Amino acid sequence: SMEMDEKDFAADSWSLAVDSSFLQQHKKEVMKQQDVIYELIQTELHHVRTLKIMTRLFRTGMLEELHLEPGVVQGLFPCVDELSDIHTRFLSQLLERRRQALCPGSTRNFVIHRLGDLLISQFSGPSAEQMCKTYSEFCSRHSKALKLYKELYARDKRFQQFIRKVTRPAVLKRHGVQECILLVTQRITKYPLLISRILQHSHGIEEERQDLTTALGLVKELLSNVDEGIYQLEKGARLQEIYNR
């Protein structure tokens, strides 16, 4: 992540990120709502960072340093550029809503009152169609990616040295190749939990409660479509094993 955003989301909560004199001006219910919105944006910033480790550190590093057979890097990192485009765009919209809400003279004091409409836009129309198509493809290639990674790490010396080299720093502790893949797969199922908790503290404005209710339904529809569209691909599995599913 870039330093400006890391610092804006360094605190454990919105209530610790804003100036204490600004915090004191809000009702308890507003603080509760803002703390959960801040967790949604903070976790989305970290998710985009996970995708940047996959595209830039791993994928591009393997293309520039290793001599892997064609189709191997794509097999290890299926759909990573499409996933990066989807979430970098969503993160950009969340961060622009925060930036517009800042008080003049401050780079940390804000309240986001209208998140619902942004979530309806993200989880409907062409952007929801692209999220559904991309996660149905990625999650169906999850077992195949893990198996290809394990085979290469166990049999290719230069590949094992590369992985050990780039994952040695302490900041990569939670972000090995397989760990990145499961962080990405699990991201989509975090959204309902976060949206439901924001909705719990958004009754103050009826239009906002209605918009978050619509967004939660759209996210659950997307998850149900992705879940029904998954079938694990397996290298070497014969047609007979597939049509006898």
Partner: protein, 179 residues
């Protein structure tokens, strides 16, 4: 230090997310309790052996039968959770969770964990459960369920007070290290 993977499973109200948060911070959050848990790698030394224990939550995956099993590959130990304030969460252990974990994680040790043990003697909890003809799970009911499902062991803890939390993860590490 060898790397091992832990996954926690159980119903949405079992307290699995809170348990991972409290263990990973060695603290129940004083300002904000997070809604979600991403992952974590804990450095644990148990009985003289150093392990890096990767921790994962299945919260949010309960309704998605094709997405949820993607969390299971290469798991070394399962924490199978229920809440002591919810006999309904204990009833779902042999019905759904046990056959699923046995299928996707064959021969992986399962530790059955009774969460929220601080609510066993909470008056509000006892009054609320009595309306549905229920009562908090007794320790012998937890041990019997663990015995029946072939669990490696039975343990209890409270994420609120931290009691028993360290012990659960140290035992999970010992289970992960066994042949």
């Amino acid at each position: 230090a060898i790397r091992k993977k832990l996954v926690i499973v159980g119903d949405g109200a079992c307290g699995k997310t809170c348990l991972l948060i409290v263990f990973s911070k060695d603290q129940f959050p004083e300002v904000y309790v997070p809604t979600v848990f991403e992952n974590y790698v804990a450095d644990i030394e148990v009985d003289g052996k150093q392990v890096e224990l990767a921790l994962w939550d299945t919260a949010g995956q309960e309704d998605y039968d094709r997405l949820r099993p993607l969390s299971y590959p290469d798991t070394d130990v399962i924490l199978m959770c229920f809440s002591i304030d919810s006999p309904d969460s204990l009833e779902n252990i042999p019905e759904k969770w046990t056959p699923e974990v046995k299928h996707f994680c064959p021969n992986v040790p399962i530790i059955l964990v009774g969460n929220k043990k601080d609510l066993r003697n909470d008056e509000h909890t006892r009054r609320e459960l009595a309306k549905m003809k229920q009562e908090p799970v007794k320790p012998e009911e937890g041990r019997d369920m663990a015995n029946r499902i072939g669990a490696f062991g039975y343990m209890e803890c409270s994420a609120k007070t931290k009691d028993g939390v360290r012990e659960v993860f140290e035992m999970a590490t010992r289970a992960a290290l066994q042949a």
